[PDB]
Amino acid sequence: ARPCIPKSFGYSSVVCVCNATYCDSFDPPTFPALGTFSRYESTRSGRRMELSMGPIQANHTGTGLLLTLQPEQKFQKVKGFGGAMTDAAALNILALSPPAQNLLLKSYFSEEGIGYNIIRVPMASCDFSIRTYTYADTPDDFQLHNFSLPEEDTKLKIPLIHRALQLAQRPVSLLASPWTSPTWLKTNGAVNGKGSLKGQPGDIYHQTWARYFVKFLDAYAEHKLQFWAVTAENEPSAGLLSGYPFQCLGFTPEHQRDFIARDLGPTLANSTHHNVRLLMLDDQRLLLPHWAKVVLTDPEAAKYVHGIAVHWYLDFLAPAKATLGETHRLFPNTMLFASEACVGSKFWEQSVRLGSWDRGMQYSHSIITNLLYHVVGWTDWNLALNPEGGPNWVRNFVDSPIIVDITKDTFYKQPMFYHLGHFSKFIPEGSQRVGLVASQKNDLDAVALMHPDGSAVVVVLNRSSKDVPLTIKDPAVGFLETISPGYSIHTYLWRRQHHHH
Ligand SMILES: *[C@@H]1O[C@H](CO)[C@@H](O[C@@H]2O[C@H](CO)[C@@H](O)[C@H](O)[C@H]2NC(C)=O)[C@H](O)[C@H]1NC(C)=O
Ligand SMILES: *[C@@H]1O[C@H](CO)[C@@H](O[C@@H]2O[C@H](CO)[C@@H](O)[C@H](O)[C@H]2NC(C)=O)[C@H](O)[C@H]1NC(C)=O
Ligand SMILES: NC[C@@H](O)CNS(=O)(=O)c1ccccc1F
Ligand SMILES: NC[C@H](O)CNS(=O)(=O)c1ccccc1F
Numbered sequence: 001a002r003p004c005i006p007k008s009f010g011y012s013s014v015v016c017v018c019n020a021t022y023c024d025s026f027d028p029p030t031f032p033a034l035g036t037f038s039r040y041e042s043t044r045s046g047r048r049m050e051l052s053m054g055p056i057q058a059n060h061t062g063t064g065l066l067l068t069l070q071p072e073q074k075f076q077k078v079k080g081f082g083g084a085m086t087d088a089a090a091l092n093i094l095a096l097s098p099p100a101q102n103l104l105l106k107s108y109f110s111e112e113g114i115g116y117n118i119i120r121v122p123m124a125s126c127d128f129s130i131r132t133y134t135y136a137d138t139p140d141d142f143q144l145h146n147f148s149l150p151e152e153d154t155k156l157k158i159p160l161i162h163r164a165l166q167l168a169q170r171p172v173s174l175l176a177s178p179w180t181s182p183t184w185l186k187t188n189g190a191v192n193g194k195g196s197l198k199g200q201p202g203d204i205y206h207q208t209w210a211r212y213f214v215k216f217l218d219a220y221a222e223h224k225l226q227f228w229a230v231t232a233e234n235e236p237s238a239g240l241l242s243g244y245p246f247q248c249l250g251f252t253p254e255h256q257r258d259f260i261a262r263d264l265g266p267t268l269a270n271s272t273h274h275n276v277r278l279l280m281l282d283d284q285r286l287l288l289p290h291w292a293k294v295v296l297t298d299p300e301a302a303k304y305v306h307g308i309a310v311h312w313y314l315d316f317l318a319p320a321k322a323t324l325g326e327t328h329r330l331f332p333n334t335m336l337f338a339s340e341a342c343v344g345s346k347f348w349e350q351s352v353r354l355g356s357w358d359r360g361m362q363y364s365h366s367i368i369t370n371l372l373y374h375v376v377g378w379t380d381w382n383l384a385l386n387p388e389g390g391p392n393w394v395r396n397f398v399d400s401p402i403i404v405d406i407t408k409d410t411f412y413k414q415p416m417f418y419h420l421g422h423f424s425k426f427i428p429e430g431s432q433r434v435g436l437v438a439s440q441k442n443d444l445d446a447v448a449l450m451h452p453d454g455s456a457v458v459v460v461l462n463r464s465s466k467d468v469p470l471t472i473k474d475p476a477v478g479f480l481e482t483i484s485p486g487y488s489i490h491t492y493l494w495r496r497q498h499h500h501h
């Protein structure tokens with residue numbers, strides 16, 4: 001509908017520049033007729049989700065690389081894609097003028113944008129906050145009579161969530177996660193540092209903490225927001241670490257098991273919010289499968305846990321087959337969901353690299369890895385940051401797919417935004433991953449899914465410098481002759497006519 005306005009900041013690719021009167025956008029989503037495919041292309045050279053169409057052909061005479069769709073080989077159903085409405089993201093979005101705020105939110109949540117259908121909401125403050133607070137800071141209030149939402153929620157986050165929901169045609173799911181409890185429930189009496197809930201699961205401290213979740217859901221329900229899921233704690237391993245710099249609450253896996261079994265599971269199930277799903281872990285994948293074994297081999301905890309939330313720190317390496325693969329093998333009925341991903345977190349990495357194609361490729365490669373290892377969704381971290389990668393009260397700056405520059409009333413869409421978009425826009429909730437088989441060894445990364453209405457989507461990532469000709473075969477439909485240019489990502493969509501073999 002409106003093309004990217006590119007700008008270079010001296011990194012490998014460009015950002016797209018948006019402001020109070022202009023942002024790139026798509027037309028309303030339409031499928032090509034039977035016999036035609038749609039291709040959306042982004043390239044390092046600067047193409048940004050450019051649409052082209054081609055014929056599906058009955059015949060293929062070539063002998064080069066063939067990717068054959070396996071539409072009856074079915075894997076996981078997809079919950080969706082989105083990102084996090086932290087205090088930092090809310091402050092950056094609202095620092096824009098109302099026209100630019102609108103264009104930013106449309107970029108993410110509308111059908112003329114990339115179709116996000118998940119928002120992660122911190123329960124009170126985290127590092128991406130400028131004030132440290134919980135919802136029940138008044139000490140020894142075990143019945144939580146003074147629980148209440150501050151303006152960070154009522155004036156910033158809740159109104160923005162409502163605006164996102166109005167722009168979305170897809171139903172949006174909210175996920176909530178706490179970082180710290182009130183300090184009077186913790187062993188160390190501080191929001192950060194090494195410390196856990198006082199006492200033992202099943203006691204007053206633990207019962208109060210579980211009740212805080214229900215008060216949170218109650219308070220958001222007064223504002224007409226309902227949650228799809230909650231996690232039992234953001235990064236429970238972090239609060240076991242001496243000197244941890246920001247809000248945390250430490251649980252060993254046995255502690256989380258007992259908390260869920262004795263306190264959180266029973267309290268949620270006894271509430272009006274009993275349909276809210278509970279996700280365990282909410283931490284890095286190398287804690288799996290150990291954490292899953294500890295929690296899910298206890299039948300009393302197991303009966304409360306709907307899924308396992310995992311974090312992706314894209315600056316780091318970790319095995320996927322031994323963590324996500326093994327967890328799926330051992331616990332195939334417990335969904336895996338990626339609840340946070342970020343890049344640029346190491347202190348020595350420039351937090352915001354405007355126009356980094358490499359960070360874009362890290363994002364899409366991670367998403368493909370995630371989907372090939374049975375994960376049902378992918379959630380980015382902060383929806384928007386400033387050019388420092390903040391604000392952040394401990395200076396823990398990081399990158400974001402949208403960077404806001406208040407001094408120019410401008411925001412910049414990073415390659416990461418488009419890499420994520422190649423998935424979020426084209427994979428509706430309820431899509432199912434299907435198999436995709438290469439005829440010969442090759443350098444491409446790819447994934448195939450089927451929409452709820454039977455349509456096909458294939459994402460093809462080329463992290464190499466070399467242009468790779470290829471053909472996609474859909475046994476029921478025909479052949480798509482294409483090329484994967486060096487340093488590109490493509491999404492292919494087509495309708496699948498009924499066909500008998
Ligand atoms: C927002 O950005 C747009 C796009 O860059 C600006 O519009 C451009 O302005 C230059 C300078 O006058 C023109 O030469 C271009 O033709 C314009 N392009 C388009 C597509 O309109 C616009 O001025 C900016 N708006 C604000 C409020 O700063
Ligand atoms: C389970 O939830 C019910 C909600 O009905 C709680 O029952 C109420 O508890 C409050 C005090 O906490 C009383 O003022 C009400 O009279 C109770 N209502 C009824 C209908 O009995 C109950 O406390 C919860 N149980 C837990 C958390 O163990
Ligand atoms: N030509 C295939 C090869 O390049 C690997 N790509 S892949 O199969 O898509 C893939 C598998 C596992 C994790 C991430 C991945 F990207
Ligand atoms: N994982 C979420 C947690 O709130 C920490 N925020 S962060 O963006 O991941 C991060 C940034 C900089 C340095 C270290 C970090 F962990």
Ligand SMILES: NC[C@H](O)CNS(=O)(=O)c1ccccc1F
Pocket residue numbers: 028029030031111115170425426427428429451493
């Ligand atoms: N429209 C949102 C829907 O839930 C799925 N969208 S879609 O089918 O992948 C699509 C098709 C054509 C053009 C753009 C698209 F996004």
Ligand SMILES: *[C@@H]1O[C@H](CO)[C@@H](O)[C@H](O)[C@H]1NC(C)=O
Pocket residue numbers: 058059
């Ligand atoms: C495909 O091949 C066969 C001939 O072997 C025939 O159906 C047709 O001529 C070819 N072309 C198309 C577009 O079907």
Ligand SMILES: [K+]
Pocket residue numbers: 134135136137138146147148149
């Ligand atoms: K309060």
Ligand SMILES: [K+]
Pocket residue numbers: 344345346347348349350351397398
């Ligand atoms: K950094």
